[PDB]
Write a protein that binds this ligand. Sequence first.
Ligand SMILES: COc1ccc(S(=O)(=O)N2CCC(O)(CO)CC2)c2c1CCCC2
Length: 139
Amino acid sequence: PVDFTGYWKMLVNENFEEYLRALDVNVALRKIANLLKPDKEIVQDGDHMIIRTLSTFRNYIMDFQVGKEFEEDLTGIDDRKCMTTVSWDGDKLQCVQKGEKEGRGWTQWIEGDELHLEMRVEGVVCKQVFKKVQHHHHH
Ligand SMILES: COc1ccc(S(=O)(=O)N2CCC(O)(CO)CC2)c2c1CCCC2
């Protein structure tokens, strides 16, 4: 069984500017966000999953029950809210974010020491890869 618990450091962030543009993030804020290399701190506790995206600019925290649709507040990302469901798809974790934007969601999986995160909106695809790490720092 797949367990995402751990601390993960960003290695690559591919096509993030177009993903942000598709979310209508303003130009000045895209400049800031494109420089960020956030960590992921994940705790999988039964079906309760916490995914913290940690950066020097701000943190974005997801805290949900797998399988249960919830109102996700993305105010700090693109000023939207979505009805979001995160579910298992075999060994992958799928997120569908229903809202104003078509085809918004993400897929997360592990390969070896890598956390893979593919983020999608309106036919744009952004791919991030993080490496599992062990030196922890307070947040
Ligand atoms: C404008 O500032 C942002 C825009 C997008 C992202 S982000 O795309 O890395 N981010 C994590 C993945 C997801 O949760 C997927 O829905 C969206 C939010 C983030 C920020 C600022 C701080 C942390 C991350």
